[PDB]
Amino acid sequence: ASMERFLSVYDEVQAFLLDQLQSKYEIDPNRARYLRIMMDTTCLGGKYFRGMTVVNVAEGFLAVTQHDEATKERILHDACVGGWMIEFLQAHYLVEDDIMDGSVMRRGKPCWYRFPGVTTQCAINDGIILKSWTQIMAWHYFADRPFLKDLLCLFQKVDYATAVGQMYDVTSMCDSNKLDPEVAQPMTTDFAEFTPAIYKRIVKYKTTFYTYLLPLVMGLLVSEAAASVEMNLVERVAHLIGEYFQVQDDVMDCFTPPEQGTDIEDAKCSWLAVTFLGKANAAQVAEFKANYGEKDPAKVAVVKRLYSKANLQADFAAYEAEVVREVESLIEQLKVKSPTFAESVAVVWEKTHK
Amino acid sequence: ASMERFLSVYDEVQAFLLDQLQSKYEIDPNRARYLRIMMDTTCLGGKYFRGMTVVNVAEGFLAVTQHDEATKERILHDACVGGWMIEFLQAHYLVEDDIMDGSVMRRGKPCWYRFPGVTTQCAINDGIILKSWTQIMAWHYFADRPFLKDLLCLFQKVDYATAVGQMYDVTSMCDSNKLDPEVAQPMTTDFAEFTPAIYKRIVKYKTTFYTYLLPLVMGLLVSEAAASVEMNLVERVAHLIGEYFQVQDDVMDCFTPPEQGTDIEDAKCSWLAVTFLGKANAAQVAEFKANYGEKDPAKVAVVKRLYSKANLQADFAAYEAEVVREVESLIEQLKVKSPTFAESVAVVWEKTHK
Numbered sequence: 172a173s174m175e176r177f178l179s180v181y182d183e184v185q186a187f188l189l190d191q192l193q194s195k196y197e198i199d200p201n202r203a204r205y206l207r208i209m210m211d212t213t214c215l216g217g218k219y220f221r222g223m224t225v226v227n228v229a230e231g232f233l234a235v236t237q238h239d240e241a242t243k244e245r246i247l248h249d250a251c252v253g254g255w256m257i258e259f260l261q262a263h264y265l266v267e268d269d270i271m272d273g274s275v276m277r278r279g280k281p282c283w284y285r286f287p288g289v290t291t292q293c294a295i296n297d298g299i300i301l302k303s304w305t306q307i308m309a310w311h312y313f314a315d316r317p318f319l320k321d322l323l324c325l326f327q328k329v330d331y332a333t334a335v336g337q338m339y340d341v342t343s344m345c346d347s348n349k350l351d352p353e354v355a356q357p358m359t360t361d362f363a364e365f366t367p368a369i370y371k372r373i374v375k376y377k378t379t380f381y382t383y384l385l386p387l388v389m390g391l392l393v394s395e396a397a398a399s400v401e402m403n404l405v406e407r408v409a410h411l412i413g414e415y416f417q418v419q420d421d422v423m424d425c426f427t428p429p430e431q432g433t434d435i436e437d438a439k440c441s442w443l444a445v446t447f448l449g450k451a452n453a454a455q456v457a458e459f460k461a462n463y464g465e466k467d468p469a470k471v472a473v474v475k476r477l478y479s480k481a482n483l484q485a486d487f488a489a490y491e492a493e494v495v496r497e498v499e500s501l502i503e504q505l506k507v508k509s510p511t512f513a514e515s516v517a518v519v520w521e522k523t524h525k
Numbered sequence: 526a527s528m529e530r531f532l533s534v535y536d537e538v539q540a541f542l543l544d545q546l547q548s549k550y551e552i553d554p555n556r557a558r559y560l561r562i563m564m565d566t567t568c569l570g571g572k573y574f575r576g577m578t579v580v581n582v583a584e585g586f587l588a589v590t591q592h593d594e595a596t597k598e599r600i601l602h603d604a605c606v607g608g609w610m611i612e613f614l615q616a617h618y619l620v621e622d623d624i625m626d627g628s629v630m631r632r633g634k635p636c637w638y639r640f641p642g643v644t645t646q647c648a649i650n651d652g653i654i655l656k657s658w659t660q661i662m663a664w665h666y667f668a669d670r671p672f673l674k675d676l677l678c679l680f681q682k683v684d685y686a687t688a689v690g691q692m693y694d695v696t697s698m699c700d701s702n703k704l705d706p707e708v709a710q711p712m713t714t715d716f717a718e719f720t721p722a723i724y725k726r727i728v729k730y731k732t733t734f735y736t737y738l739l740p741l742v743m744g745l746l747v748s749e750a751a752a753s754v755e756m757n758l759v760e761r762v763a764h765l766i767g768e769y770f771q772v773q774d775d776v777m778d779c780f781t782p783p784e785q786g787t788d789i790e791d792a793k794c795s796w797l798a799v800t801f802l803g804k805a806n807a808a809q810v811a812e813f814k815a816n817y818g819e820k821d822p823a824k825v826a827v828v829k830r831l832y833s834k835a836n837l838q839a840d841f842a843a844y845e846a847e848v849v850r851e852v853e854s855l856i857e858q859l860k861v862k863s864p865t866f867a868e869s870v871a872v873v874w875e876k877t878h879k
């Protein structure tokens with residue numbers, strides 16, 4: 172029912188956005204059709220975990236709070252709209268990051284900019300529109316809601332934290348002291364910045380704010396339940412689950428078959444490179460430096476072989492055990508003020524851990 | 526004094542943004558330096574007409590309204606911050622549009638993405654940060670202002686109208702009925718969509734909202750003076766002055782020497798192409814179709830020669846006379862409710878017309 176309600180609200184949001192373009196922005200039907208296809212191609216197809224977390228958090232509070240049926244329906248509708256603002260925000264990131272990174276495929280389909288009738292000229296602007304649409308949704312659907320100011324303020328900080336994260340991510344293969352707009356950026360030779368703390372900073376800002384913090388805090392906001400939680404705990408658990416999620420994506424980029432990654436070629440500061448450097452002997456480090464960040468398949472094969480013989484699964488299982496420990500602890504600390512919210516965080520963890 | 530105060534506030538805004546990155550976003554000093562150079566290169570160098578209009582509108586109201594000195598200083602400071610949000614919004618557009626259009630130069634300097642240490646990978650994200658910074662400024666400086674909700678709501682609509690305008694602009698050389706993300710877009714052969722009404726729609730959305738409406742309405746908002754005006758008149762005069770401004774830029778793109786344009790090669794729906802088609806005979810139209818939208822300098826020379834022999838200066842002088850007439854009329858209609866605001870619009874017109 173929740174997924175069914177969530178997908179139904181997409182149809183209503185799309186019709187509202189397209190009809191407003193016609194009545195207020197002088198759009199013609201062909202341009203409305205182009206934007207309709209753009210919206211469907213960039214916003215749909217995923218699993219909707221981010222958007223659905225808003226719905227799941229709100230449903231949790233509905234079960235333990237007294238409301239009229241019309242209030243229950245309004246809260247669910249608000250959780251669905253809020254969920255779609257997050258999915259559209261993600262769509263904005265995916266379109267822009269695919270252009271920035273020169274990506275080829277996204278969810279077994281070509282990246283949006285690669286469609287023949289799209290091109291980078293239109294796709295950069297299509298990504299800008301996707302983010303504008305999140306604000307149009309908020310100002311229209313939440314016009315008279317007491318949580319409107321807090322929701323816009325939170326969405327803004329998360330979006331800015333994400334833009335900051337993308338900057339940390341795309342400059343992670345360069346020496347900080349050499350960053351200069353005037354001079355072409357060489358790849359690092361010492362890899363001195365491939366450390367656990369620097370990797371944690373990249374991940375924290377690039378994904379955790381919008382993938383985990385935003386859905387959980389939006390669920391609280393639409394429920395008028397922000398008092399039922401200690402915000403310092405919500406932030407701590409979101410960054411922690413968020414970090415684990417990225418570590419899984421970094422492992423998959425290298426080892427998950429294409430049908431089911433270019434982090435080595437792009438010389439990314441991945442969990443695999445950081446972990447490898449933290450345990451490798453002098454000769455393994457020299458061989459890593461000689462092969463990393465090269466498009467040559469023979470060199471990518473050497474890096475993968477180094478990762479395979481380094482037994483990084485042991486470090487991953489030890490990292491996983493520590494995260495299980497810390498997540499269980501934070502969930503317990505959340506149970507004090509809100510057993511309902513703690514259960515929502517437990518579900519988020521189960522969906523991440525699986 | 527006003528320019529001097531405006532430029533002083535840039536230093537304070539830059540220090541606030543960079544210091545917040547350090548204390549809240551874990552930025553290192555090299556990344557802060559990269560963003561400082563990015564901000565200066567993209568936001569400074571222009572004439573600041575957009576930002577300064579906010580200041581000029583507020584100064585106009587200060588002269589006719591009773592306030593304590595501390596209130597006068599706060600209003601001016603608010604007009605300056607609001608002015609810089611517009612300049613940063615423009616910077617965002619210029620960075621993104623230069624990447625989209627493949628532009629080479631911007632204000633006698635290379636476009637931001639073309640700097641050796643920047644690249645498209647960083648520049649798309651730098652443009653996203655420039656827009657995020659406009660929201661950080663608003664939420665920090667206007668946190669407790671009664672105009673905060675209206676200002677954010679207006680800024681959002683203007684930004685979305687601009688994104689819509691960029692879409693109308695980049696798709697203006699294509700047949701509407703052929704727009705399709707699945708099929709590579711051919712240039713128009715009939716030029717049936719190169720009409721005054723279609724050209725007016727492009728211009729209205731791509732520049733007039735952010736160049737003229739936003740500065741004037743922001744000046745009113747920071748002054749708590751939105752009642753002193755008929756908003757339908759403000760919109761009418763902004764779109765009208767805005768249209769005239771773009772017509773001047775379209776003429777300059779073709780005839781102003783590079784030291785002091787690619788609209789012909791990019792097959793843009795410019796005022797020159799629209800006006801030419803509106804008066805040309807059958808053989809002139811055939812010669813236009815045979816040469817427009819081609820990078821070949823011999824073909825660009827034919828188009829320029831057609832424009833020169835078509836006596837478009839006569840049509841420009843007649844368009845100019847009609848705009849002078851309509852602007853004078855709207856200024857008179859504004860004088861009824863606010864002689865102060867009407868004088869601010871008269872100054873905006875004088876700076877545009879010169």
Ligand SMILES: Cn1cc(C(=O)N2CCc3sccc3C2)ccc1=O
Nearest residue numbers: 218220221224382383416519522523
């Ligand atoms: C590709 N993909 C992604 C996800 C995902 O976006 N996650 C993990 C779980 C949650 S719960 C709240 C947010 C998330 C983030 C889950 C399964 C999957 O196949």
Ligand SMILES: Cn1cc(C(=O)N2CCc3sccc3C2)ccc1=O
Nearest residue numbers: 572574575578736737770873876877
């Ligand atoms: C390049 N350049 C631009 C401008 C400009 O941005 N305008 C024209 C006047 C006004 S007043 C309020 C907004 C505007 C817009 C003026 C002189 C110039 O050299």
